[PDB]
Write a protein that binds this ligand. Sequence first.
Ligand SMILES: CC(=O)N[C@@H]1[C@@H](O[C@@H]2O[C@H](CO)[C@H](O)[C@H](O)[C@H]2O[C@@H]2O[C@@H](C)[C@@H](O)[C@@H](O)[C@@H]2O)[C@H](O)[C@@H](CO)O[C@H]1O
Length: 162
Amino acid sequence: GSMLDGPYQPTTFTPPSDYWILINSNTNGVVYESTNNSDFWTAVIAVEPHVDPVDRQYNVFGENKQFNVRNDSDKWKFLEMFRGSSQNDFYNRRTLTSNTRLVGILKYGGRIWTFHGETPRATTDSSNTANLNGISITIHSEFYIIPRSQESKCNEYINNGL
Ligand SMILES: CC(=O)N[C@@H]1[C@@H](O[C@@H]2O[C@H](CO)[C@H](O)[C@H](O)[C@H]2O[C@@H]2O[C@@H](C)[C@@H](O)[C@@H](O)[C@@H]2O)[C@H](O)[C@@H](CO)O[C@H]1O
């Protein structure tokens, strides 16, 4: 393969450990939905530039939800919405403000890692789970696969683009 392997078309799958999934977001709305149905639900919402605070409807994990969103940047903003238990409300856990429209997720070392902050200085952070292998993802845009060992490149792509 290539080190940067893709693009792959939208699908649902169980990500392999130790590869970055790099998603080229092409629109507003749900970029991906990821859960193991027990303790980990993350959905990322894309919010186009210059959106004043507004309540929008999104379907996530087959549930209509209303999220208040805003973006006061020229860049796109990606909202990580999380719940760690089925009955809890989703909350906005992390954001990534980005000119490149690339969003990253990785299973590595018992945890899920994602990029947050603001390009070109976006950085990674981890999220815990007691069922890492059970996490599946439905990705609604094209994506790429890059080994964790080449995170340096992944970071470059997240921060400066393809
Ligand atoms: C110390 C370490 O290995 N950190 C890993 C993370 O990689 C770091 O990511 C931060 C942003 O949050 C910085 O970019 C930092 O430079 C990164 O460390 C560099 O790259 C990593 C992959 C290693 O090669 C390290 O030697 C190098 O300095 C990484 O994001 C997470 C999740 O994969 O694991 C951390 O251990």
